[PDB]
Amino acid sequence: MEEGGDFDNYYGADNQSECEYTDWKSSGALIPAIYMLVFLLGTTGNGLVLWTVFRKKGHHHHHH
């Protein structure tokens, strides 16, 4: 029974929107996980097999 008569435009309704109830969900108690399961599957995967082969080549970085 939230009075307010007509014209009731709710107001300050943002008090129930993505503002400070989802971003602060954790921050320091949730990232250490997703960043732990994506650490061995977001870099260790590959992105390297090329680097190593980048110092070899066996030419001159050219192929015109």
Short mmCIF file of N, CA and C in Angstrom, two decimals:
data_model
loop_
_atom_site.label_atom_id
_atom_site.label_comp_id
_atom_site.label_asym_id
_atom_site.label_seq_id
_atom_site.Cartn_x
_atom_site.Cartn_y
_atom_site.Cartn_z
N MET A 1 0.86 -1.22 0.00
CA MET A 1 0.00 0.00 0.00
C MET A 1 0.88 1.24 0.00
N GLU A 2 1.57 1.48 -1.12
CA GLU A 2 2.44 2.64 -1.23
C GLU A 2 1.66 3.85 -1.74
N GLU A 3 1.15 4.65 -0.80
CA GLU A 3 0.39 5.84 -1.16
C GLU A 3 1.18 6.71 -2.13
N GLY A 4 0.67 7.91 -2.39
CA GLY A 4 1.34 8.84 -3.29
C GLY A 4 0.34 9.52 -4.21
N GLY A 5 -0.92 9.12 -4.10
CA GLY A 5 -1.97 9.71 -4.93
C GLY A 5 -1.63 9.60 -6.41
N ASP A 6 -2.47 10.19 -7.25
CA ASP A 6 -2.24 10.16 -8.69
C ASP A 6 -0.88 10.76 -9.04
N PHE A 7 -0.59 10.86 -10.33
CA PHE A 7 0.68 11.43 -10.79
C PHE A 7 1.86 10.59 -10.31
N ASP A 8 1.59 9.61 -9.45
CA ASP A 8 2.64 8.75 -8.93
C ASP A 8 3.57 8.29 -10.05
N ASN A 9 4.70 8.97 -10.19
CA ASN A 9 5.66 8.63 -11.23
C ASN A 9 6.80 7.79 -10.65
N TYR A 10 6.50 7.06 -9.58
CA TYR A 10 7.51 6.22 -8.94
C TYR A 10 8.65 7.07 -8.39
N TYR A 11 9.45 7.62 -9.29
CA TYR A 11 10.58 8.46 -8.88
C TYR A 11 11.66 7.61 -8.21
N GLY A 12 12.91 8.04 -8.35
CA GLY A 12 14.02 7.32 -7.75
C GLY A 12 13.84 5.81 -7.91
N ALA A 13 13.19 5.41 -9.00
CA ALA A 13 12.96 4.00 -9.27
C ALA A 13 14.28 3.28 -9.53
N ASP A 14 15.31 4.05 -9.88
CA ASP A 14 16.62 3.48 -10.15
C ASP A 14 17.12 2.68 -8.95
N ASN A 15 16.46 2.86 -7.81
CA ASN A 15 16.85 2.15 -6.60
C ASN A 15 16.60 0.65 -6.75
N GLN A 16 16.12 0.25 -7.92
CA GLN A 16 15.85 -1.15 -8.18
C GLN A 16 16.30 -1.54 -9.59
N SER A 17 17.46 -1.04 -9.98
CA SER A 17 18.00 -1.34 -11.31
C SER A 17 19.50 -1.58 -11.24
N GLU A 18 20.05 -2.15 -12.30
CA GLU A 18 21.49 -2.43 -12.35
C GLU A 18 22.29 -1.18 -12.00
N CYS A 19 22.56 -1.01 -10.71
CA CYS A 19 23.32 0.15 -10.25
C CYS A 19 24.32 -0.25 -9.17
N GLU A 20 23.80 -0.79 -8.07
CA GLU A 20 24.65 -1.21 -6.97
C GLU A 20 24.13 -2.51 -6.35
N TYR A 21 23.67 -3.42 -7.21
CA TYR A 21 23.15 -4.70 -6.74
C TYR A 21 23.60 -5.83 -7.66
N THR A 22 24.46 -5.50 -8.61
CA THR A 22 24.96 -6.50 -9.55
C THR A 22 26.46 -6.31 -9.79
N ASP A 23 26.89 -5.05 -9.84
CA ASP A 23 28.29 -4.74 -10.07
C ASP A 23 29.12 -5.06 -8.82
N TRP A 24 28.52 -4.85 -7.65
CA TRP A 24 29.21 -5.12 -6.40
C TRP A 24 28.88 -6.52 -5.89
N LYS A 25 28.20 -7.30 -6.73
CA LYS A 25 27.83 -8.66 -6.35
C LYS A 25 29.00 -9.37 -5.68
N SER A 26 30.22 -9.02 -6.09
CA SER A 26 31.41 -9.63 -5.52
C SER A 26 32.63 -8.74 -5.76
N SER A 27 33.11 -8.73 -7.00
CA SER A 27 34.27 -7.93 -7.36
C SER A 27 35.54 -8.54 -6.78
N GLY A 28 35.52 -8.83 -5.48
CA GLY A 28 36.67 -9.43 -4.82
C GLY A 28 36.33 -10.81 -4.28
N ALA A 29 35.34 -11.45 -4.89
CA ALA A 29 34.92 -12.78 -4.47
C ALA A 29 34.13 -13.46 -5.58
N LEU A 30 34.68 -13.43 -6.79
CA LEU A 30 34.02 -14.04 -7.93
C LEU A 30 34.95 -14.02 -9.15
N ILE A 31 35.78 -12.99 -9.24
CA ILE A 31 36.71 -12.86 -10.35
C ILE A 31 37.86 -13.86 -10.23
N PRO A 32 38.33 -14.15 -9.04
CA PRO A 32 39.45 -15.11 -8.83
C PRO A 32 39.12 -16.50 -9.35
N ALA A 33 37.86 -16.70 -9.73
CA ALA A 33 37.43 -17.99 -10.25
C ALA A 33 37.41 -17.98 -11.78
N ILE A 34 36.56 -17.14 -12.35
CA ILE A 34 36.45 -17.04 -13.80
C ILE A 34 37.82 -16.77 -14.42
N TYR A 35 38.67 -16.07 -13.68
CA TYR A 35 40.01 -15.76 -14.16
C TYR A 35 40.96 -16.93 -13.93
N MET A 36 40.48 -17.93 -13.20
CA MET A 36 41.30 -19.11 -12.91
C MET A 36 41.00 -20.23 -13.90
N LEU A 37 39.75 -20.28 -14.37
CA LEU A 37 39.35 -21.31 -15.32
C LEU A 37 39.61 -20.84 -16.75
N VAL A 38 39.79 -19.54 -16.92
CA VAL A 38 40.05 -18.98 -18.24
C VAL A 38 41.54 -18.68 -18.42
N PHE A 39 42.31 -18.90 -17.36
CA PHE A 39 43.75 -18.66 -17.41
C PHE A 39 44.45 -19.76 -18.20
N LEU A 40 44.00 -21.00 -18.00
CA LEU A 40 44.59 -22.13 -18.70
C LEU A 40 43.83 -22.43 -19.99
N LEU A 41 42.85 -21.59 -20.30
CA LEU A 41 42.05 -21.77 -21.50
C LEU A 41 41.83 -20.43 -22.21
N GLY A 42 42.73 -19.49 -21.97
CA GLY A 42 42.62 -18.17 -22.59
C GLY A 42 43.99 -17.67 -23.04
N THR A 43 45.00 -18.52 -22.90
CA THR A 43 46.35 -18.15 -23.30
C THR A 43 47.22 -19.40 -23.47
N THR A 44 47.33 -20.19 -22.40
CA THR A 44 48.12 -21.41 -22.44
C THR A 44 47.75 -22.25 -23.65
N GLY A 45 46.53 -22.06 -24.15
CA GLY A 45 46.06 -22.81 -25.31
C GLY A 45 47.07 -22.75 -26.44
N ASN A 46 47.13 -21.61 -27.13
CA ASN A 46 48.06 -21.44 -28.23
C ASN A 46 48.71 -20.06 -28.17
N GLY A 47 48.35 -19.19 -29.11
CA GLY A 47 48.92 -17.85 -29.14
C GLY A 47 50.41 -17.87 -28.82
N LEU A 48 51.03 -19.03 -29.02
CA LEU A 48 52.46 -19.17 -28.75
C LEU A 48 53.14 -19.93 -29.87
N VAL A 49 52.52 -21.02 -30.31
CA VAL A 49 53.08 -21.83 -31.39
C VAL A 49 53.58 -20.95 -32.52
N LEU A 50 53.11 -19.70 -32.54
CA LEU A 50 53.52 -18.76 -33.58
C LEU A 50 54.72 -17.94 -33.13
N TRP A 51 54.67 -17.46 -31.89
CA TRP A 51 55.76 -16.66 -31.35
C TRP A 51 57.09 -17.37 -31.54
N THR A 52 57.20 -18.58 -30.99
CA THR A 52 58.43 -19.35 -31.11
C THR A 52 58.87 -19.44 -32.57
N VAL A 53 57.92 -19.77 -33.45
CA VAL A 53 58.22 -19.88 -34.87
C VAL A 53 58.41 -18.50 -35.49
N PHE A 54 58.40 -17.47 -34.65
CA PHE A 54 58.57 -16.11 -35.13
C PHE A 54 60.04 -15.70 -35.07
N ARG A 55 60.82 -16.44 -34.28
CA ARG A 55 62.25 -16.14 -34.15
C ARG A 55 63.06 -17.01 -35.10
N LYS A 56 62.40 -17.98 -35.72
CA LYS A 56 63.08 -18.87 -36.66
C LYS A 56 62.89 -18.39 -38.09
N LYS A 57 61.71 -18.66 -38.64
CA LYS A 57 61.40 -18.25 -40.01
C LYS A 57 62.33 -18.96 -41.00
N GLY A 58 63.60 -18.59 -40.97
CA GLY A 58 64.58 -19.20 -41.87
C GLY A 58 64.64 -18.45 -43.19
N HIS A 59 64.30 -17.17 -43.16
CA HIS A 59 64.32 -16.35 -44.37
C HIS A 59 64.73 -14.92 -44.04
N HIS A 60 63.76 -14.01 -44.06
CA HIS A 60 64.03 -12.61 -43.77
C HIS A 60 62.73 -11.83 -43.58
N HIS A 61 61.69 -12.53 -43.13
CA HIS A 61 60.40 -11.90 -42.91
C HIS A 61 59.87 -11.30 -44.20
N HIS A 62 60.15 -11.96 -45.32
CA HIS A 62 59.70 -11.48 -46.62
C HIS A 62 59.32 -12.65 -47.52
N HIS A 63 58.43 -12.40 -48.47
CA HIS A 63 57.99 -13.43 -49.40
C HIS A 63 57.27 -12.82 -50.59
N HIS A 64 57.84 -11.75 -51.13
CA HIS A 64 57.25 -11.07 -52.28
C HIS A 64 57.19 -12.01 -53.48
#
